[PDB]
Design a protein around this ligand. Structure first.
Ligand SMILES: CCCCCCCCCCCCCCCCCC(=O)OC[C@H](COP(=O)([O-])OCC(O)COP(=O)([O-])OC[C@@H](COC(=O)CCCCCCCCCCCCCCCCC)OC(=O)CCCCCCCCCCCCCCCCC)OC(=O)CCCCCCCCCCCCCCCCC
Ligand SMILES: CCCCCCCCCCCCCCCCCC(=O)OC[C@H](COP(=O)(O)OCCN)OC(=O)CCCCCCCCCCCCCCCCC
Ligand SMILES: CCCCCCCCCCCCCCCCCC(=O)OC[C@H](COP(=O)(O)OCCN)OC(=O)CCCCCCCCCCCCCCCCC
Ligand SMILES: CCCCCCCCCCCCCCCCCC(=O)OC[C@H](COP(=O)(O)OCCN)OC(=O)CCCCCCCCCCCCCCCCC
Ligand SMILES: CCCCCCCCCCCCCCCCCC(=O)OC[C@H](COP(=O)(O)OCCN)OC(=O)CCCCCCCCCCCCCCCCC
Ligand code: HEC
Ligand code: HEM
Ligand code: HEM
Ligand code: HEM
Ligand SMILES: COc1c(O)c(C)c(C/C=C(\C)CC/C=C(\C)CC/C=C(/C)CC/C=C(\C)CC/C=C(\C)CCC=C(C)C)c(O)c1OC
Ligand SMILES: COc1c(O)c(C)c(C/C=C(\C)CC/C=C(\C)CC/C=C(/C)CC/C=C(\C)CC/C=C(\C)CCC=C(C)C)c(O)c1OC
Lengths: 24, 54, 66, 98, 238, 139, 55, 373, 76, 48, 184
C-alpha cells in the first residue's frame, strides 16, 4: 500500500529550519 | 601530477604503445599460406614504388 | 615633410613577399607593352600587388600616422 | 537484418527513454481507437512509460543505460489491436463504395 | 572586379572607442578648406558641431564665417545673412548640373553619408583619397579623368585633392597627405553618424545591465523550474 | 603520381579542397594496404567479414586523411599563416582524434593526437627546411 | 538619360562600329527576332526606354 | 469575469507540455517583435513624410535631429531582421517536430509569413534610397511576369508608368496598415492552436504531463525576451549597420542604378530560386512555391511518428535541407557568373526534391525499419 | 482544461519546495557531462551537412577567383 | 539576513517599497559609474 | 469549427429579443461606419502627405487629380459626421431604455466615445486648412489649463513651441492608429 515506500532521497538536490527559513 | 599523471604520460604510455604494437605484429597463425601472400603484397607494393617513382 | 605613408610603403615593399609580387607585375607590364596587338592590362596584376602592400601598410601605417 | 534493426533501434533512441515502439506512434484517429481498446493494464503502463519519458525530456536527460529498453524485450502491445482498427476501417470503406 | 580596401586600425573601431573628437576637428577643417568646393554636406548643419568638437559660441563664429542669402524678403527676392547656427553647410554648385558642368559631368556625391553609403567606406575613403597611383599599361581613361585603383572602374572624375601640405592644420599637426586623409575620413565618418559616441555609451550600459540581469532572471527561472526538475515519478500498479 | 605531388605545389592553406582530397586518398591507400596485410595474416572467418575489415580500415584511414587535410588547410587560412608548422600539428592533432573515435577510445586519441600531430608537424618542418628522405648516395 | 515617364529614358547615340556593325547581326546570330535598324529611324540615334526586360 | 475567463484560461492556466525546449520560446518572441516593430514604427511615423520630395531627408532628420531618433530607426530595422530570424527558427521548429499536422495553425502561419514578407518589402522601399528604388522596381517588375493580368497590375501598384511618388505614398499606407492585420491573424493563429494545444519535442501525447504556464513558461518567455533584447540591442548599439546595405545611404537616383543589387538577407533564398529558373514566369512560380511548399507540407507526412526525435534518416535529410537553405542564402548574394549559377540551380533542385520526394520515402523506410509498414 | 486532460492511474509524484532546494545543484557537476553526452548523440546527424556547406562555400569562392583569373593565353 | 526578510520582504508592499527606493538610487550610481568608466575607457578621445 | 463557432455564437444563433425597435440597429451601423471610415481612410492615405508644405496640396490633388478622389474624401468627412450621428443616437438609446445597468458594456462604451472624439479631432486637424490650424491650437491650449504639468503636456503634444509640422505628422500617425484600437 502507501507505506511500501518512502519519499525518494532528494538530498542530492536538497540544500544545506525556520531559523534558516527567512535566510533561505 | 607526480606518480599518475607524469608516469602515465611519458614512462608508462611508451610502455603501452610498444606492448600493444608487438601484440598485433607477433600474433601470427604460423600457417605458410598467410605468410606467403604477405610476400605477394610486398612484391606488389615494391613493384609500384618503382613504378610511380619511375 | 615626410608623410608616414611614404616611409611605410617603403618598408612594406621591402617585404619579400611583396617584392616577388612587384616583379611579376613588371613582367606583365613589359609583356603587355611588348605585345603589340593586345588589350590585356596589368591592372589585375597591379591589383594583386596592392592588396598585399596595402595589407602590410595597414599593419604599420596607422600607428606611424598621428 | 537484425543487426541493422537493433542498430537503428539504438539510433532512434526511443529505447533510451524507456519507450517501446508502440509508445511512439502518433495518435491518429485509428491509433487512438486501438489505444482505447487496450486492456487497462497496458494502458496504465503505457501512460507511465510516456509520462516518464516526458519528465526525462524535461531535464534533457536519459535513463540509466541498464533501464534502457532492449530490442528483444520490446513488445508490440498495440500492434495486434491496431491491425483490427485498420481492418475494420477498410471494410467500412469498401462497403461505402458498394 | 574591384580592389578591396584593407582594414586600418581606426581608433573609433573599438567596441567602446568613441570618435577622437579631436581629430574630427582637424578633418572638418579639411572639408571646409578643400572638399567644400565641389561636395555638399547637405545633412550637416553648423549647429550639429556644437558638443562634438566646437563649443556653442565657437560654432557661432564659424556659422557667421559664411554668407547665406534667403529669398523671402519684404520687397526683395532675397536677403543675405551670415550663416546662423541653424544654417546648414553651404553647398556649392546649387544645381547638380552646375557641378556636372565644372566636374566633367561627374556629380561630387554628397559626402554627408558617403562613409555609410560606400562599402567599407572609412577605408574606401582613405584608400581613394590616397590611392591616386600611376595608371597601368593599356589603360585609356577618357578626357578629364585620373587613376585610382579603388574607385569603381578605376576612373574617378575627381582629381586628386590632397597634395601633401594642401592645407595647414590650425592645431599645427603636420599636414601630411595621410594625416589629412585620416582626419577627413574620421570627420566624414562622424558626419555619417553624429551619434557614434553617444550610442557606444548606451551599448556599454546595456552590456553592464544585461550582465547583471541575465543570471538573475536565469536564477528566478531555475527556482520556479527546480520544482519540476526534481519531481520524481514512480509507477505503482496496485 | 603527378597528382599527390600537387598537394605540395600550391601554397598551404590554399585550395583546401584539393588538399583534403589528396590527403584522403593517401590515407585510403594506406587503408587498403593495411587491411591487406591485416587480412593476409590474421585472416578472417568469412569473405564478407574480411571485406568489412578492409572497409573499416579503409574508411578509418581515409578519415584520418581527411581531417588532417581539412584541419591543417583551414587552420592555415584562419590563422593567416601558411608556413607555421603548428598548423600541421593541429591537423595531425585532429587526425589522431578521428582515429581515436573510430577505435572508440579517448586514450588512443591522446597518444594519437600527440604522436600523430608531432609527426605531421615534422613533415611541415621537413618541407620548410628541405630535409631529404631516402637520399641518393652522394657521400 | 531623360527619365521620360519616370523610366530613366535612354536616348543613345552610336559610334561608327555601332551604327554599321549592328546590322551584321544577321538574324540567327540575333538572340531576338527584331531588326537592329527597324529599332532606329536613324541608326546613329538609338532611342530606347532604358529598362532591361529582366525584372 | 468574462475577460479574466479569457485571460487566465489562455495565458495563465493553459495546460502546456512540461518538456518543450527553448525553440518553443521563439513564437512568443515573434509576438514581442511585432509589438516592438509597431511601437518603433509609430515613433517613426510622427516624423516620416511619404513625399518623394522629403523622404530621404525625412529619414535623415530621423537619424540626425530627432531625439534618440537614430535609436528608434535602427531598432526598427534590426527588429525587422530579428523578426525574420525568429520567423525562420519558428518555421524550422514546425518542420522538424511535425507541428504541421496542426493544419489550420500551419495555414494561418503561412498566411502570416506572406503578410510579413510583403510588409518588410514595402518597409524597405519606404526610406527612398538608391537601393530601395531599384529593389522596388525590380521585383515589382517581377509582377510584370503574368502575360495578360500582370503588366497593368504592376503599374497599378506603381500607380503609374514607373515607381515614383505614387508608389511611395501607397507603400507607406500599406506598410502602416498590414501589421495590424498580422496581429489579427496572429490572434486567429493562437486560437486555432489552443483548440489543440502545443506539441512537444518527443512528438507524443503529452496529456499525462502538463503544467501551468504562468510560473513555468512565463518566466521562460521572459528570459527568452531578455536574451532576444540582448541580441537586438547589441546589433543596434554596437553593430548597427551590420545587417543593412551601404548603398541605401545614397538618395534614390533613377538615372543611375546601384552596381551590386541584392535583396536583404532574409529574402535571398527566394532570390536564388528566382534567378535559378531560366524562365521568368518559372522563377516567379518557383519562388512562390518556395514559400508555399510549406503549406503543402502537412499532406506529405507519411510517418507513424509525429516528431523527428526518434527518426535519424529524416533528421539527416532535415539538416541537409537547412544546409542548402543556407547555400541558397549565400548564392543570392553572389553575382551572376560561374559557378554560382550552377550551385543555385542544383541547390533549388535539391531543395524541392528533399521536401517533395526524399522525406516521405525516408519516412516509409523508417516505418519499415521498426516493423510497422 | 485541467482536470479533464487525461486519465492516469497509480502514478505517484513527489516534489520539493523551491526554497528548500539549491538553485543550480551540481550544475557544472553534471551539466558538463550531460551537455557533452548530448552533443555526442546529435553531432553526427547535425555537423557533416554544414561541413560540406563550408567546403562548397570555399570551393565556390576559390573557383570564382580562378574564373576571374586571366587566361595566360588571353590577348597574346 | 532575517532582518531583511522580516522587515523588507515580509510585507509585499515593503518588497515593492525597497525596490522603488533602490530604483531611485540605482540610476544615479549606475549612470555615473558607467559614465566614468566610459570616460576612462575613452579617456583622451572626447570633446572636453 | 473553432473559428465558425464564435461567428455562430455572436451573429447567427445568438438569442436576441424579438421586440427591439429600429434604435437597436444603430450600433451595428456604427460598426459599419467604422469600417467605411477605415476603408476610406486607407484610400486617403495612399495620396496624403503629412507635411505642412504639401498637406493642402495633397488634399487638393486628391480632390482634383485622383480618379474619384473627391468621392472618397467627402465620403470620409460625411462618414465621420454619420458616425457621430449614429453615436449620439446609440448613447440616447442607452440612456432612455436603461441599458447603462450593463455597467461594463457602458464603461467600454464611454472609452470608445472618448477615443472616437480624439480620432475625429486629429483627423479634422489633418487637412491643414485655416480652420484646422486654429482649431488645433485652441484645443491643444485647452490642456494648458492643467494646474501644474499643463504647459509641458501641451508642448509635448505640439512637439514644439506651437503647433507646426511637428504636430501634423504625429497627428497623422495617431489618427491612423486609433481606429484599430477602437475596433479592438
Ligand atoms: C608524449 C606523451 C603523450 C601522452 C598522451 C597520453 C597517453 C595516455 C596513456 C596511453 C594510453 O592511454 O593508451 C591507451 C591505448 C589503448 O589502446 P590499446 O589497448 O593499445 O589498443 C591497441 C590494440 O592493438 C587493439 O587491439 P585490436 O585487436 O583491436 O587491434 C586492432 C588495431 C587497429 O584498430 C582497429 O581495429 C581499427 C583500425 C585502426 C587502424 C586502421 C588503419 C591502419 C593503417 C595501417 C597502416 C600501415 C602502413 O588496434 C590498434 O592497433 C590501435 C593502434 C593503431 C595505430 C595506428 C595505425 C594507423 C591508423 C591510422 C593511419 C593514418 C595514416 C595517415 C596518412 O593504447 C594505445 O592505443 C596507444 C597508441 C597506439 C598507437 C596510436 C597511433 C600512434 C601512431 C600514429 C601513426 C604513425 C605516426 C608516426
Ligand atoms: C622525454 C622522456 C622520454 C622517456 C622515455 C622513457 C622510456 C622508458 C619508460 C619506462 C619503460 C618501461 O617501464 O618498460 C616496461 C615495459 C613492459 O615491461 P614489463 O612490464 O617488465 O614486462 C616484461 C615482463 N613480462 O617494457 C616495454 O614494453 C618497452 C618499454 C620501452 C622500452 C624502450 C622504448 C624506446 C622507444 C624509442 C622510440
Ligand atoms: C615500418 C614498421 C611498420 C609496422 C607495421 C607494419 C604493418 C602495418 C599494417 O598495415 O598492418 C599490420 C600488419 C598486419 O596486421 P596484424 O598485425 O597481423 O594484425 C591485424 C589485426 N590486428 O602487421 C603484421 O602482420 C606485420 C606486417 C609486416 C610487413 C608489413 C609492413 C611492410 C612495410 C612496408 C614495406 C615495403 C617493402 C617494399 C619492398
Ligand atoms: C582547461 C583544462 C583543459 C585540459 C585539457 C586536457 C584534458 C582534457 C580531459 C577531458 C576528459 C578526458 C577523459 O575524461 O578521458 C580520460 C582518458 C580516457 O580514460 P578512460 O579510462 O577511457 O575513461 C574515460 C571514461 N569517460 O584517459 C586519457 O588517456 C587522458 C589523456 C589526456 C590527459 C590530459 C591531461 C594530462 C595531464 C598531464 C600532466 C603532466 C604534468
Ligand atoms: C543547430 C543545431 C541545433 C541542434 O542541437 O540540433 C539537434 C537537436 C536535437 O534535438 P532532439 O533530437 O529532439 O533531442 C532532444 C534531446 N533533449 O534537434 C533540434 O535542435 C531541432 C531544432 C528545431 C528548429 C531548428 C531550426 C533550424 C533553422 C531552420 C531554418 C529554416 C526553416 C525552414 C524555412 C523554410
Ligand atoms: C577641387 C575638386 C575636388 C576636391 C578638392 C575633392 N573632390 Fe571628391 N570629387 C570631385 C568630383 C568632380 C567628383 C565626381 C567624380 C566621379 O563621380 O567620378 C568627386 C567624387 C568623390 C567621391 C565619389 C567616389 C565614389 O565612390 O563614387 C568621393 C568618395 C570623394 N570625391 C571624396 C573626396 C574626399 C574624401 C576629398 C577630400 C578629403 C575630396 N573628395 C576632395 C571633386 C573634388
Ligand atoms: C504598424 C507598424 C509599423 C509602422 C507604423 C511602421 C512604420 C515605418 C516607417 C515610417 C518606416 C520608414 C522608416 C525608414 O525606413 O527609414 C518603416 C521602415 C521599415 N519598416 Fe516599418 N512599420 C511598422 C511595422 C513594421 C513591421 C512589422 C516590419 C517587419 C515586417 C517593418 C519593417 C520595416 C523595415 C524593414 C523598414 C525599412 C528599414 C530601413 O530603412 O532599412 N515595419 N516602418
Ligand atoms: C510572425 C508570425 C507568427 C507568430 C507571431 C506566431 C506565433 C505563434 C505562437 C505564439 C505560437 C504558440 C506556440 C509557440 O510559440 O511555440 C505559435 C505556434 C505555432 N506556429 Fe506560429 N507564429 C507565426 C508564424 C508561423 C508560421 C509562418 C508557421 C508555419 C511555418 C507557424 C507555425 C506554428 C505552429 C505549427 C505552431 C504550433 C507549434 C506548437 O505549439 O507545438 N507559425 N505561433
Ligand atoms: C484607420 C482609419 C482611418 C484612416 C486611415 C484615416 C485617414 C485619414 C486621412 C489620410 C485624412 C486626411 C485626408 C482626408 O481624409 O481629408 C483623414 C481626414 C479625416 N478623418 Fe480620418 N482616417 C481614419 C479613420 C477616421 C475615423 C474613424 C474618423 C471619424 C471619427 C475620421 C475622421 C476624419 C475627419 C473628420 C477627417 C478630416 C476630413 C476633411 O479633411 O475634411 N477618420 N483621415
Ligand atoms: C500556452 O500556450 C500559449 C498560449 O496560451 C498563448 C496565449 C500564447 C501567446 C503568447 C504571446 C505573448 C504571444 C503574443 C501573440 C500575439 C497575439 C501577437 C499580437 C501582438 C500584438 C500587437 C498584441 C502562447 O505563445 C502560448 O504558447 C507558449
Ligand atoms: C444582439 O444583436 C446583435 C449582436 O449579437 C451583434 C454581435 C451585433 C454586431 C453586428 C454588427 C454588424 C455591428 C458591427 C460588429 C462588429 C464586431 C464591428 C466590427 C468592425 C470593426 C472595424 C472591428 C449587432 O449589431 C446586434 O444587433 C443588431
Amino acid at each position: 500500500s502507501h507505506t511500501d515506500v518512502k519519499v525518494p532521497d532528494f538530498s542530492d538536490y536538497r540544500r544545506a529550519s525556520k531559523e534558516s527559513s527567512e535566510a533561505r | 601530477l607526480d606518480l599518475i599523471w607524469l608516469e602515465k604520460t611519458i614512462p608508462k604510455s611508451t610502455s603501452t604503445l610498444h606492448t600493444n604494437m608487438t601484440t598485433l605484429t607477433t600474433n601470427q597463425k604460423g600457417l605458410i599460406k598467410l605468410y606467403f601472400m604477405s610476400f605477394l603484397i610486398n612484391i606488389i607494393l615494391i613493384i609500384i614504388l618503382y613504378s610511380i617513382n619511375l | 615633410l615626410v608623410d608616414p605613408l611614404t616611409t611605410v610603403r617603403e618598408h612594406c615593399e621591402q617585404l619579400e613577399k611583396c617584392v616577388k609580387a612587384r616583379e611579376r607585375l613588371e613582367l606583365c607590364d613589359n609583356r603587355v607593352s611588348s605585345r603589340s596587338q593586345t588589350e590585356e592590362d596589368c591592372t589585375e596584376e597591379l591589383f594583386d600587388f596592392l592588396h598585399a602592400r596595402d595589407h602590410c601598410v595597414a599593419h604599420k601605417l596607422f600607428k606611424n600616422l598621428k | 537484418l537484425d543487426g541493422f534493426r537493433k542498430w537503428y533501434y539504438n539510433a532512434a533512441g526511443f529505447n533510451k527513454l524507456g519507450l517501446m515502439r508502440d509508445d511512439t506512434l502518433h495518435e491518429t484517429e485509428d491509433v487512438k481507437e486501438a489505444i482505447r481498446r487496450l486492456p487497462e493494464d497496458l494502458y496504465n503502463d503505457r501512460m507511465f512509460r510516456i509520462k516518464r519519458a516526458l519528465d526525462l525530456t524535461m531535464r534533457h536527460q536519459i535513463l540509466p543505460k541498464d533501464q534502457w529498453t532492449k530490442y528483444e524485450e520490446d513488445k508490440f502491445y498495440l500492434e495486434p489491436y491496431l491491425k483490427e482498427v485498420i481492418r475494420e476501417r477498410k471494410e467500412r470503406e469498401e462497403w461505402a463504395k458498394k | 572586379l574591384e580592389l578591396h580596401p584593407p582594414s586600418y586600425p581606426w581608433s573609433h573601431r573599438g567596441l567602446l572607442s568613441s570618435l577622437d573628437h579631436t581629430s574630427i576637428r582637424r578633418g572638418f577643417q579639411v572639408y571646409k578648406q578643400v572638399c567644400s568646393s565641389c561636395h555638399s554636406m547637405d545633412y550637416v548643419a553648423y549647429r550639429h558641431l556644437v558638443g562634438v568638437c566646437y563649443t556653442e559660441e565657437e560654432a557661432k563664429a564659424l556659422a557667421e564665417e559664411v554668407e547665406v542669402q534667403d529669398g523671402p524678403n519684404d520687397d526683395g527676392e532675397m536677403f543675405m545673412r551670415p550663416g546662423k547656427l541653424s544654417d546648414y553647410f553651404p553647398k556649392p554648385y546649387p544645381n547638380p548640373e552646375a557641378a556636372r558642368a565644372a566636374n566633367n559631368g561627374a556629380l561630387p556625391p554628397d559626402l554627408s553619408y558617403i562613409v555609410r553609403a560606400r562599402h567599407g567606406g572609412e577605408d574606401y575613403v582613405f584608400s581613394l583619397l590616397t590611392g591616386y597611383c600611376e595608371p597601368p599599361t593599356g589603360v585609356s581613361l577618357r578626357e578629364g579623368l585620373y587613376f585610382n585603383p579603388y574607385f569603381p572602374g578605376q576612373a574617378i572624375g575627381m582629381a586628386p585633392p590632397i597634395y601633401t601640405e594642401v592645407l595647414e592644420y590650425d592645431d599645427g599637426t603636420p599636414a601630411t597627405m595621410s594625416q589629412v586623409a585620416k582626419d577627413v575620413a574620421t570627420f566624414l565618418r562622424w558626419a555619417s553618424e553624429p551619434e557614434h559616441d553617444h550610442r557606444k555609451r548606451m551599448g556599454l550600459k546595456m552590456l553592464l545591465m544585461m550582465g547583471l540581469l541575465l543570471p538573475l532572471t536565469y536564477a528566478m527561472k531555475r527556482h520556479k523550474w527546480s520544482v519540476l526538475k526534481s519531481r520524481k515519478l514512480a509507477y505503482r500498479p496496485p | 603520381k603527378r597528382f599527390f605531388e600537387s598537394y605540395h605545389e600550391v601554397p598551404d592553406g590554399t585550395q583546401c579542397h584539393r588538399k583534403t582530397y589528396i590527403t584522403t586518398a593517401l590515407g585510403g591507400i594506406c587503408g587498403i594496404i593495411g587491411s591487406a596485410y591485416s587480412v593476409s595474416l590474421n585472416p578472417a572467418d568469412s569473405t564478407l567479414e574480411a571485406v568489412a575489415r578492409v572497409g573499416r580500415y579503409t574508411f578509418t584511414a581515409a578519415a584520418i586523411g581527411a581531417m588532417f587535410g581539412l584541419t591543417t588547410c583551414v587552420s592555415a587560412q584562419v590563422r593567416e599563416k601558411p608556413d607555421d608548422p603548428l598548423n600541421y600539428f593541429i591537423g595531425g592533432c585532429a587526425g589522431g582524434l578521428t582515429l581515436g573515435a573510430r577505435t572508440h577510445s579517448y586514450g588512443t586519441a591522446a597518444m594519437g593526437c600527440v604522436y600523430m600531430g608531432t609527426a605531421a608537424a615534422l613533415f611541415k618542418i621537413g618541407k620548410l627546411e628541405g630535409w631529404e628522405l631516402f637520399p641518393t648516395p652522394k657521400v | 538619360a531623360f527619365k521620360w515617364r519616370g523610366k530613366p529614358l535612354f536616348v543613345r547615340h552610336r559610334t561608327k562600329k555601332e551604327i554599321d556593325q549592328e546590322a551584321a547581326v544577321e538574324v540567327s546570330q540575333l538572340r531576338d527576332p527584331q531588326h537592329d535598324l527597324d529599332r532606329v529611324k536613324k541608326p546613329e540615334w538609338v532611342i530606347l526606354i532604358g529598362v532591361c526586360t529582366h525584372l | 469575469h468574462p475577460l479574466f475567463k479569457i485571460i487566465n484560461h489562455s495565458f495563465i492556466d493553459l495546460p502546456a507540455p512540461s518538456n518543450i525546449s527553448s525553440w518553443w520560446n521563439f513564437g512568443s518572441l515573434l509576438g514581442v517583435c511585432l509589438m516592438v516593430q509597431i511601437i518603433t514604427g509609430l515613433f517613426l511615423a510622427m516624423h516620416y513624410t511619404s513625399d518623394t520630395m522629403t523622404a530621404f531627408s525625412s529619414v535623415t532628420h530621423i537619424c540626425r535631429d530627432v531625439n534618440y531618433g537614430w535609436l528608434i530607426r535602427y531598432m526598427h530595422a534590426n527588429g525587422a531582421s530579428m523578426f525574420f530570424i525568429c520567423l525562420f527558427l519558428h518555421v524550422g521548429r514546425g518542420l522538424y517536430y511535425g507541428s504541421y499536422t496542426f493544419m489550420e495553425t500551419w495555414n494561418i502561419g503561412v498566411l502570416l509569413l506572406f503578410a510579413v514578407m510583403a510588409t518588410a518589402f514595402m518597409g524597405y522601399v519606404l526610406p527612398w534610397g538608391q537601393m530601395s528604388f531599384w529593389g522596388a522596381t525590380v521585383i515589382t517588375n517581377l509582377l510584370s511576369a503574368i502575360p495578360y493580368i500582370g503588366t497593368t497590375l504592376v503599374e497599378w501598384i506603381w500607380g503609374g508608368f514607373s515607381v515614383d511618388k505614387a508608389t511611395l505614398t501607397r507603400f507607406f499606407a500599406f506598410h502602416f496598415i498590414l501589421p495590424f492585420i498580422i496581429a489579427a491573424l496572429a490572434i486567429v493563429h493562437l486560437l486555432f492552436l489552443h483548440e489543440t494545444g502545443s506539441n512537444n519535442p518527443t512528438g507524443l501525447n503529452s496529456d499525462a504531463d502538463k503544467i501551468p504556464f504562468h510560473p513555468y513558461y512565463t518566466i521562460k518567455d521572459i528570459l527568452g525576451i531578455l536574451i532576444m533584447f540582448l541580441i537586438l540591442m547589441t546589433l543596434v548599439l554596437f553593430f548597427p549597420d551590420m545587417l543593412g546595405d551601404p548603398d541605401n545611404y545614397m538618395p534614390a537616383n533613377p538615372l543611375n542604378t546601384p552596381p551590386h543589387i541584392k535583396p536583404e538577407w532574409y529574402f535571398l533564398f527566394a532570390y536564388a530560386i528566382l534567378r535559378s529558373i531560366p524562365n521568368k514566369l518559372g522563377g516567379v512560380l518557383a519562388l512562390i512555391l518556395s514559400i508555399l511548399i510549406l503549406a503543402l507540407m502537412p499532406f506529405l507526412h507519411t510517418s507513424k511518428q509525429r516528431s523527428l526525435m526518434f527518426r535519424p534518416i529524416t533528421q539527416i535529410l532535415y539538416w541537409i535541407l537547412v544546409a542548402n537553405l543556407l547555400i541558397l542564402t549565400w548564392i543570392g548574394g553572389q553575382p551572376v557568373e560561374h559557378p554560382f549559377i550552377i550551385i543555385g540551380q542544383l541547390a533549388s533542385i535539391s531543395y524541392f526534391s528533399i521536401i517533395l520526394i526524399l522525406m516521405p520515402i525516408s519516412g516509409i523506410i523508417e516505418d519499415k525499419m521498426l516493423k510497422l509498414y | 482544461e485541467f482536470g479533464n486532460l487525461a486519465r492516469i492511474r497509480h502514478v505517484i509524484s513527489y516534489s520539493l519546495s523551491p526554497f528548500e532546494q539549491r538553485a543550480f545543484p551540481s550544475y557544472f557537476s553534471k551539466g558538463i557531462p550531460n551537455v557533452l553526452r548530448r552533443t555526442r548523440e546529435r553531432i553526427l546527424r547535425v555537423a557533416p551537412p554544414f561541413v560540406v556547406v563550408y567546403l562548397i562555400y570555399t570551393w565556390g569562392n576559390q573557383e570564382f577567383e580562378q574564373s576571374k583569373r586571366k587566361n595566360p593565353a588571353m590577348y597574346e | 539576513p532575517s532582518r531583511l526578510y522580516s522587515l523588507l520582504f515580509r510585507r509585499t508592499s515593503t518588497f515593492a517599497l525597497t525596490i522603488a527606493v533602490g530604483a531611485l538610487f540605482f540610476e544615479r550610481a549606475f549612470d555615473q559609474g558607467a559614465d566614468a568608466i566610459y570616460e576612462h575607457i575613452n579617456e583622451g578621445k572626447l570633446w572636453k
